[PDB]
From Swiss-Prot, chain A:
Component of the large ribosomal subunit (LSU). Part of the 5S RNP complex, which is a LSU subcomplex composed of the 5S RNA, RPL5 and RPL11. Component of a hexameric 5S RNP precursor complex, composed of 5S RNA, RRS1, RPF2/BXDC1, RPL5, RPL11 and HEATR3; this complex acts as a precursor for ribosome assembly. Interacts with PML. Interacts with MDM2 (via its RanBP2-type zinc finger domain); negatively regulates MDM2-mediated TP53 ubiquitination and degradation. Interacts with NOP53; retains RPL11 into the nucleolus. The lineage of its organism: Eukaryota, Metazoa, Chordata, Craniata, Vertebrata. It comes from the Eukaryota. Its main location: nucleus. InterPro entries: Ribosomal_uL5, Ribosomal_uL5_C, Ribosomal_uL5_CS, Ribosomal_uL5_dom_sf, Ribosomal_uL5_N. Belongs to the universal ribosomal protein uL5 family. The modification N6-acetyllysine is found at K45, K78. The gene is RPL11. It is found in: Nucleus, Nucleolus; Cytoplasm. This is Large ribosomal subunit protein uL5. There is a cross-link at K31, K45, K147 (Glycyl lysine isopeptide (Lys-Gly) (interchain with G-Cter in SUMO2)).
From Swiss-Prot, chain C:
There is a cross-link at K218 (Glycyl lysine isopeptide (Lys-Gly) (interchain with G-Cter in SUMO1)). The gene is RPL5. It comes from Oryctolagus cuniculus. It comes from the Eukaryota. This is Large ribosomal subunit protein uL18. The keyword Lipoprotein does not apply. Component of the ribosome, a large ribonucleoprotein complex responsible for the synthesis of proteins in the cell. The small ribosomal subunit (SSU) binds messenger RNAs (mRNAs) and translates the encoded message by selecting cognate aminoacyl-transfer RNA (tRNA) molecules. The large subunit (LSU) contains the ribosomal catalytic site termed the peptidyl transferase center (PTC), which catalyzes the formation of peptide bonds, thereby polymerizing the amino acids delivered by tRNAs into a polypeptide chain. Residues 251-293 are annotated as: Disordered.
Swiss-Prot record, chain D:
The lineage of its organism: Eukaryota, Metazoa, Chordata, Craniata, Vertebrata. There is a cross-link at K166 (Glycyl lysine isopeptide (Lys-Gly) (interchain with G-Cter in SUMO2)). Component of the large ribosomal subunit. Mature ribosomes consist of a small (40S) and a large (60S) subunit. The 40S subunit contains about 33 different proteins and 1 molecule of RNA (18S). The 60S subunit contains about 49 different proteins and 3 molecules of RNA (28S, 5.8S and 5S). The modification Citrulline is found at R31. Pfam families: Ribosomal_L16. Its main location: cytoplasm. The keyword Transferase does not apply. There is a cross-link at K179 (Glycyl lysine isopeptide (Lys-Gly) (interchain with G-Cter in ubiquitin)). It is found in: Cytoplasm. This is Large ribosomal subunit protein uL16. PROSITE patterns: RIBOSOMAL_L10E (PS01257). Citrullinated by PADI4. Ufmylated by UFL1. It comes from Oryctolagus cuniculus. Belongs to the universal ribosomal protein uL16 family. GO terms for biological process: regulation of translation; translation.
From Swiss-Prot, chain E:
It comes from Oryctolagus cuniculus. Component of the large ribosomal subunit. The ribosome is a large ribonucleoprotein complex responsible for the synthesis of proteins in the cell. It comes from the Eukaryota. This is Large ribosomal subunit protein eL29. The modification N6-acetyllysine is found at K32. It is found in: Cytoplasm. The gene is RPL29. The modification Phosphoserine is found at S30. Belongs to the eukaryotic ribosomal protein eL29 family. Residues 1-32 are annotated as: Disordered. The modification N6-methyllysine is found at K4. Component of the large ribosomal subunit. Residues 1-25 have a biased composition (Basic residues).
Amino acid sequence: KENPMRELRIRKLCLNICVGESGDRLTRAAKVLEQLTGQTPVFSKARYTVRSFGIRRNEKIAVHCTVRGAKAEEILEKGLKVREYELRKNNFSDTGNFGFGIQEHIDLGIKYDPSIGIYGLDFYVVLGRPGFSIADKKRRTGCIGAKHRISKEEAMRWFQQKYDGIILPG
Amino acid sequence: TNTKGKRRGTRYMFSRPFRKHGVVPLATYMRIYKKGDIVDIKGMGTVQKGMPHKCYHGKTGRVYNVTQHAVGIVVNKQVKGKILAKRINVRIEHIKHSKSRDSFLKRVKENDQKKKEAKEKGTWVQLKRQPAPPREAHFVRTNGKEPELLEPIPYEFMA
Amino acid sequence: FVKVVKNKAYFKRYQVKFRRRREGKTDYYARKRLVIQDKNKYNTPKYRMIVRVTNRDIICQIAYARIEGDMIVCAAYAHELPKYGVKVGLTNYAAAYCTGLLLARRLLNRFGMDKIYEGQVEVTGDEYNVESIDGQPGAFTCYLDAGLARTTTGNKVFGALKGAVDGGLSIPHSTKRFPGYDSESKEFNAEVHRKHIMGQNVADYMRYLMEEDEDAYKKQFSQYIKNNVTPDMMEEMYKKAHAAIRENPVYEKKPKREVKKKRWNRPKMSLAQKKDRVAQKKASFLRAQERAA
Amino acid sequence: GRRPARCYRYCKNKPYPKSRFCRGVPDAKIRIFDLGRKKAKVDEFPLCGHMVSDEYEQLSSEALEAARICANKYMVKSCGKDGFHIRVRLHPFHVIRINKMLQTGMRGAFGKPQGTVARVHIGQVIMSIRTKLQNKEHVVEALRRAKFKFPGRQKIHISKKWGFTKFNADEFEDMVAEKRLIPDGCGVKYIPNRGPLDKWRALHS
Amino acid sequence: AKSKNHTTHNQSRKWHRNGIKKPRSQRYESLKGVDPKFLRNMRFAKKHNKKGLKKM
RNA sequence: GUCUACGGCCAUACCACCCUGAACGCGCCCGAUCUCGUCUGAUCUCGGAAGCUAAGCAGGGUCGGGCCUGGUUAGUACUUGGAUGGGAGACCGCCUGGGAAUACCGGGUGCUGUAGGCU
RNA sequence: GCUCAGGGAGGACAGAAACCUCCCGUGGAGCAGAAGGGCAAAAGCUCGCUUGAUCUUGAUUUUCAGUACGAAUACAGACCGU
RNA sequence: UUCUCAAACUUUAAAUGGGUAAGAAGCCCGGCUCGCUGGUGUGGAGCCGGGCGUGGAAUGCGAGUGCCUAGUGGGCCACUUU
C-alpha cells in the first residue's frame, strides 16, 4: 500500500508561443492559446536587447499560459496524440518534470484561418504531488524533502502508466 | 593633508562583525536608559541614523537626555590639553549599558550587608579592597618522588 | 561537472537567519515597529493584540515585550467556544469575532474594568471606538499584530479586531479592511459586515448547496448536519454566543492530571555507544573479508 | 639595463604586489618554479635537500631564474634528465620601483615598476631538490653552485622529511603501511580517523 | 623656500605643564538640551509644589 | 515526555541524507458561494473536515560537512621597557614584563521566557 | 507583494546567447556616481497612493579657535502623506 | 591535495594603548507635585523631611578660581615605528 498522499499528478501545463516579434503577430499568437485554454494569456517582455535575434529590451517577445486541473489534463491529451504518445529520454528533466514541442497548433483541434495562420507552441508539464505547495506559502515555508521529490525515473514510469506511452532513446 | 570627513577610517570600526550582519536583535531596542545611566558608545553600521562620531566610538559617558529613539549622553572627548565633557545625541543601537559601574553598586550593597551585620556584634569587617598581597609562607610537599631535573635541549635546525 | 555552490567555504561564511525567520513565522521588520516602546516611556508596557488564524483554530493573545521574551497577559482560543455556544465552524469570520470578543471581555474582567467599558452590547457593524471615561481608569489601548497574513479587504484578523473593539478594547483601525468595504466607489456598507459577524456569509452558502445538490452540501457541511446547525438557526446561534461570552468570560483552567511519565521521544545516543558502533562496523567489515577471502 | 641588486637588497618598503593599484608591471624572469621529473611518485624520491635563507632580504626574480638554471644543469650532469625534481619555493611578488632621471629632480619622485623581487625571511626555503637517496652529495653541490647567484648568506639543509611532503622520513613508510598516507602525485594525502565510514571502507576494500 | 608642514612634537609636553584639566564637574548640571515637552512638565511640577505644602 | 501561540539569545539551532513519530496540536489536504486576489482558487483571500503522516514539523542517527568549545601549535611568532650587548651591514642574542593564529587531535550538537494544551 | 547575480536540468522554431517551467542559489547582484561601510519577507525588484524636499523656535554633532559656512543628529510646536 | 603571497585582502588576533568606574552629589525608607506618560497614586521626573560616617583600592601631593600679559608662530637632532 503506497500512502495516497504520494499520488503523482500534473501541477500545471506551462504553454508558451515565443515568436520573437511584436504587435500583430504576437496579439494573433495570443488568439491560439485563448482559443485553446479559455483564459487570457500574459505577454512576457524581453529581458534585454539581443541585436542578433532582432529583439530589444522590454519589447514583447512571447505569450505564455499556465493551466491547472481538469483543463490542464484535457489539453495535454490533445498534445500527446500529435506525438502519438511517444517522447524521448532527454525530454524528461532531472527534477521529475517533462516537456515537448508541437510544430503547428492546427493538430490540436483549431481550424486554419487566413488572419490567425500557423503558430508552433511548446508544452511543459510540471509533475507534482500532495505537499508541493509548502515551497510557496507566506507562513511556514519549507523544502519538500528528499523522499517526496519526483525523480526522472519516477516521472518516466508515471507517463508509461498514465497515458500508456512508450519512451524511446536518441 | 588627510580628507576631513565624518566616516573616514571607519572601514572596520562601523562595520558589523563576521556572521553578525543583517537584522538588529530586538533586546537592543527594549532596555531602559535613565538619567545618570553610565553607557558605552559603539557605532553599529546597520542603523546609519543617529550614529555617534568615530571619536566617541569606544568611549563611556552618562545619559542626561532621553527622547523617543535616542539618548543625549555626556562624554569626555579630549582636544589637545583640554578635556571637554560634551553632549552627543546617539540612537539606542550605538549604545549598551556599562558593567563598569555595576561591579561597584554590588560592592556598595555588599558593604551594606557586612556593615549593618556586626554594627552591634562587634566583629570589625574589612570594607576596603586591599591590593593582592605577597603570598603568605607555606609548605610545598614532594610526596616521596624527587622533582624532575630539566636540562636545556640541544640545537637542531628544522627547515 | 560544475563548481559545487555548497562547499566548506559556503558553510564557513554562511550566517543563519533568526530561528523565527528560519521557521518562517515572525516578520522582524514589522515586529521592531509593533513591539518596542519609546525610550522616554521607560517600561510603560506596549501591548499588541496577536490574532493567529490556524487551519482549525483562531488564537487571539495580548502580549507586551520584555527582554526575556514577550509575556502573554491574556489568551482566547476559538476551540473554547463550544462552552459559550458555537459548536462548529471555529475558523470562520463569525468565530474570529467571538474569539476577539472573548479576549476583550476576559482581559477587562482581570483589570477590574468589567462594568466600565461594556463596548457594543447590541452588535451593529459600524465603526465603534472605546472612548476613555473621566474619573475612571482609562481604556485598554493595544495595537493589531496581523502577523504575515496579506491584509486584504475582509481578512479574518480584522474580524477579531472588530470582535475586541466591540468588546471594550481601544485598538486604532479603519473600516477599509472590514468585509463590506466597497473598493470601487470607496464607501463602507456596514450591513455586509454584520452578515459576516453574524455568519450569514456561510448560511447563504449552506442554502446555495442545500437547494442545488445535497451531494456537495454533505461533503462541504458534514459537521453542520452532525451538530444540528441549520442556516435559519445561524444568526441567533452567534447572538446567544456573543451574550454568553460577556456573562462569564473568565477562564477555568483544565486540571493537570497525574502523568505516569513514559518517554515517547528517543533519547540522545551517548559517546560510548557512537564510538562503539563504528568499532562494531569496522569489525563487521573485516570478518566480511576473512569469511569472503 | 637594470640597476645592481645592492640597490634593492633589503626589505626596505612594505610589500608592494602586482595588483589593481600597481599596474604596468614588467614580466618576472622566473616562470618555471619546478622542473626535473616533477611527474614523480613520493615513494621513489625520498631524499629532499633545502637551500635556506639566513638573512631577511629581497632576492631578485633574475637571481632566482639564474640559480634555478645553475642547479638544473649540474643535476642533469649528475643525476640525468629524470633523476631529480627541483622546486623554487619563492615567487617574486614584491614590485621594485625606478625613479628614471632621463630635468624634474626629487619633485614628484614615485617610481614606475622596474622589476619584481622575492621577499625572503631568516629560515625560509629558497629552492629544494628531491631525488634518490644515493644522490645526496650531488644535491648539496647543486645548491652550493646556486648559492653564488644570491646575495647574503644561504645554508644547505638536508630534510628529515620524505621528499616535498610535511611527514618525517623515519615515519613515512609506517604511515603508508596503515594507509594514513596514500600517494597522489608528488604529494601524499593525509587520511584521518574523522571522515564518513564509507570513505574508510574504500581504504580497506 | 619649502618649510616644515605639520608636527605635534612639543605639544604633549606643553599640554601637561598646567595639567590636562578634567572639566569642573559641578553638582546640579544645567537642563540645557533636555527635551522641551519633558522640561515644560518638570517646570509645571515645580510651579504647583505650593499646592501640597500642608499635606507634606 | 512533548507540542502550539508569541518570543529572548541567534548554527551546540545550519546543511545533507536516513530513521521514528502515542495523544493533543500543527499541517498537507476538500472546495470557491461569500470577502479578496489572480494568465491560472498554485500563491493570496475565503468556506470546510472525506483522507493521510507522504511531506513540512518534532526527535534520533552519521568514525557526516559546518558550527561551538578546549588541546596542540607555543612560551613559538610578535611585543612594553633596558644596555658604551653582538654584527661592516642585514639582522640577531640577552635582561625586564606581556603573549598570539592555522595545519593537527579531542569533546559538544540548541538553551529558554510568558500563555495555553496533550500524555 | 516579490527575490537577486550566477549555475544545473528540461522544453516547437531556438543555436553560446529570445522565451517557458522546476531545482540549487549568504547576496557572490542591485542600491545614479568614486571607494568604503551597510542591506534579503530589505535599503534591492515590481506596483499602489503621495509631496516630511513643506511651516517654525531653540539644543547638539562634524571641521573647530571649540568661530563661521556647508553637511549632519536628536527633540519640540504646527500642518500633512502613507 | 600542494608551492608561494597582499599598504589600499581577511576568518582569527596580540604587546603597547584609549574610555569609564572605585560612594555622603552616596545608599536608604517615607510623603508631596506634574498640564509629561497612562489599563492601573502605572511610568518617569521634580520637590520636601527623616535615618545611615568602618570616608569604602595602592602611592604621592594643599588646592580652587579670575583678570592683565610678553615673547613665539624659520627649528634641528637621537632610540623605536614610518
